[PDB]
């Protein structure tokens, strides 16, 4: 795997201020406006859930409503169940999921899935 | 609106200089849920006298101008005022009786806090003291609701209290003012509940009280309650 020519290890080493130079324009604008208290809270929660995970299989489920959360490179490998309005959907955090919001991975609507008269006399 | 309250606000019961603390907190400017939580902590872990002072200073003007503005009572202030009724003596001496000698109490205020009286079983002794005190002071259109509902409490009435009540009604002997239907309702409730504790002289005294101040609708009920009463 590589993202904009940059591998995951130095992505985790990559700083917050010039992480915006590989992200997109909406992405860069959002990171310039700064993450609020809920996003930092869920960052701490994900880091804690990754903390006491046993080192052989994936950590436990973290459930949230934060659909406007962006996937950051530190989240890669977390088990996040995001709300769609009715239920929670659990998703892997893959390395190539970096540029997309969390709310894209829990669709809030179901797809739409939708005898002639003949006279005898 | 909601959420956990800060721990710096739950220490005012343990803080001596509460007056400046509540003064710097802009006394005209809380909401109703803040009053609910504040009255909860000032009637739960607090003593009698400074809670009565809190009732005198803050709670009574708040409920008064709230019912003056919206002609009703908000949910949270109603819950706060009931949580003030959780401490009977402080709430009687800090809200009820100051509203009684306020003199400007309307029918809505009286009926709302009298319904609040009705929904809670108050102690008999201190309520009887309140009976005597509301009997001593003058009659307006608000304290009559309190008399009617507190006689509808149907407690064991002390006899000094009953002497004060009959002394008040003898005080209403020769007045020519048109008494309301609710006055006769109060008299009907008294002669319905405590007809057994009235001596014969009290019976006849209420009889000429009925004679001089009659009612085309409710006076025969008081007549038959007095005439079919079994004394002690």
């Amino acid at each position: 795997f590589t993202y904009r020519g940059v591998d995951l290890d130095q992505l985790l080493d990559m700083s917050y201020e010039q992480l915006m130079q590989l992200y997109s324009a909406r992405q860069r604008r959002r990171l310039n406006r700064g993450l609020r208290r809920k996003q930092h809270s869920l960052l701490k929660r994900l880091r804690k859930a990754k903390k006491e995970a046993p080192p052989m299989e994936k950590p436990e489920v973290v459930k949230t409503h934060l659909r406007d959360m962006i996937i950051l490179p530190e989240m890669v490998g977390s088990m996040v169940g995001v709300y769609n309005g009715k239920t929670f959907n659990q998703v892997e955090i893959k390395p190539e999921m970096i540029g997309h919001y969390l709310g894209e991975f829990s669709i809030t609507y179901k797809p739409v899935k939708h005898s002639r008269f003949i006279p005898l006399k | 609106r909601s959420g956990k309250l800060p721990k710096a606000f739950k220490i005012i019961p343990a803080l001596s200089n509460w007056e400046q603390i509540l003064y710097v907190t802009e006394p005209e400017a809380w909401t109703a849920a803040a009053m609910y939580q504040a009255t909860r902590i000032f009637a739960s872990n607090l003593k009698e006298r400074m809670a009565q002072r809190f009732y005198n200073l803050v709670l009574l003007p708040r409920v008064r101008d709230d019912v003056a503005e919206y002609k009703r009572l908000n949910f949270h202030l109603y819950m706060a005022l009931k949580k003030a009724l959780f401490k009977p003596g402080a709430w009687f001496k800090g809200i009820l009786i100051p509203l009684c000698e306020s003199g400007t109490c309307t029918l809505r205020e009286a009926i709302i806090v009298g319904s609040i009286i009705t929904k809670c079983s108050i102690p008999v002794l201190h309520s009887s003291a309140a009976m005597l005190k509301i009997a001593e002071m003058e009659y307006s259109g608000a304290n009559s609701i309190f008399l009617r509902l507190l006689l509808d409490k149907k407690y064991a009435l002390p006899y000094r209290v009953l002497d004060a009540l009959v002394f008040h009604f003898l005080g209403f002997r020769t007045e020519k003012r048109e008494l309301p239907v609710l006055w006769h309702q109060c008299l009907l409730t008294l002669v319905q509940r405590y007809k057994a504790d009235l001596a014969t002289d009290q019976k006849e005294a209420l009889l000429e009280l009925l004679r001089l101040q009659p009612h085309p609708q409710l006076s025969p009920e008081i007549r038959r309650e007095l005439q079919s009463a079994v004394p002690r």
Partner: protein, 59 residues
Amino acid sequence: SSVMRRNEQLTLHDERFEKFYEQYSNRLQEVLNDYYKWDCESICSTYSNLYNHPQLIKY
């Protein structure tokens, strides 16, 4: 008070009214530190009416 009184019948209680009518820090520092398919009609289609017929007596 009044002038016409009980005169009879068992005064139980004594009416204590004198208290009513005549009535009218390291903790702070540490908490300061702590501060900071089927439905009901179509199902009738699967019912049969020809199995448990009683014996018919002819005339």
